[PDB]
Amino acid sequence: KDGDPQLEFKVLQGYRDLESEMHKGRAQVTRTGDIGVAMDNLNAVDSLFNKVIGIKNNGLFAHDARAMVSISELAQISVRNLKFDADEQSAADQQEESDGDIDRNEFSQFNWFRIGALYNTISKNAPITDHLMGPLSETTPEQVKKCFKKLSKKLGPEGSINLFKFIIDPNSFSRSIENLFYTSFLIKEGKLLMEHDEEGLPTIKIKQSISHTDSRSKEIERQRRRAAHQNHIIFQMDMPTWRKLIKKYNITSPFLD
Amino acid sequence: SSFQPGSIIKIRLQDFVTYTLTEFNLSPSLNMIIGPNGSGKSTFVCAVCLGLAGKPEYIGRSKKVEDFIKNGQDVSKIEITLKNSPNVTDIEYIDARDETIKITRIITRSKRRSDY
């Protein structure tokens, strides 16, 4: 009796059938109040546990305890029903229980179905009604490379063009924003730089991208270029600001088509 | 203050991880900062957190502050400038009357925790 899977599972099965039969005696006791069911279930479970003696699987103990609790309640209720030959307390459950057809401790469907039905069937209050009349009264890298290629083509390796004259697309604010998107996401790659012209206007020139045969070497070069002193000039670009830049830097054509 | 409380100004990083020097002229209005990592944007957040009396373990990328200095460098500089709110009061060099405060955290590789 120490570890036979068959014994353990048969204990499980007998106990489950025991649970079903105890639910039957649940209703039996609710109508009547028999103690023999409780005592016999106690004996059955104890005998099965005696067989489980030496077998040591937790679930069997858990379910046995469930049985214990159920049987103890069975016995106590049956004794209460034995002491004298309350009735409403019996009845309301029975009312609830008889409104419990189910297939054969929460609140059932027809429980409240019956109860409300009964009251309606019997209420001396007449029913009521209502109404309403009167109350009725390309992915990212591809666009990135396209825009930066156009920028490099119209910029030149050392030619300098003022920043707004390039970033702005005067024909569309949305296209200008997309162009700035692409331009910045290729600036991560490191083929262009920004300097200052004689008048102090920020002019972009092509930062000659050092040809690195190894991709890792090119990535390290990009990381170093990003690590350079980043003059971070951040300006809000809205339609009023976009047109202000258009008028300030004399921008007439889309730099990045 | 004229701006909203705790308005940040340009932040200067120096000898940080890879950034020997950089300065970000920040924006008091809005910041829709879009872009992935590769130069340490999460490391940038760690820098901002640690340089302002914040434990880096809030995210957990890198823990020891002295290691945030650039490789080959034992001293890094973090100048974070804030438009001092009237709320900040009764602290060293801190008053409601104060306008701009520059927290210059010096991270030393010989010190586990930096000197603000």
Binding site: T140, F173, S174, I177, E178, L180, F181, S184, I187, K188, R226, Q230, I234, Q236, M237, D238, M239, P240, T241 | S27, S29, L30, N31, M32, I33, I34, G35, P36, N37, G38, S39, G40, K41, F44, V45
Partner: peptide, 24 residues
Amino acid sequence: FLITPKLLTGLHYHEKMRIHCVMA
């Protein structure tokens, strides 16, 4: 401040805002 890896189309914008771009 809001940190994003990428950006999408159809972004209705206004004036008081200030769109950024974190580079890393």
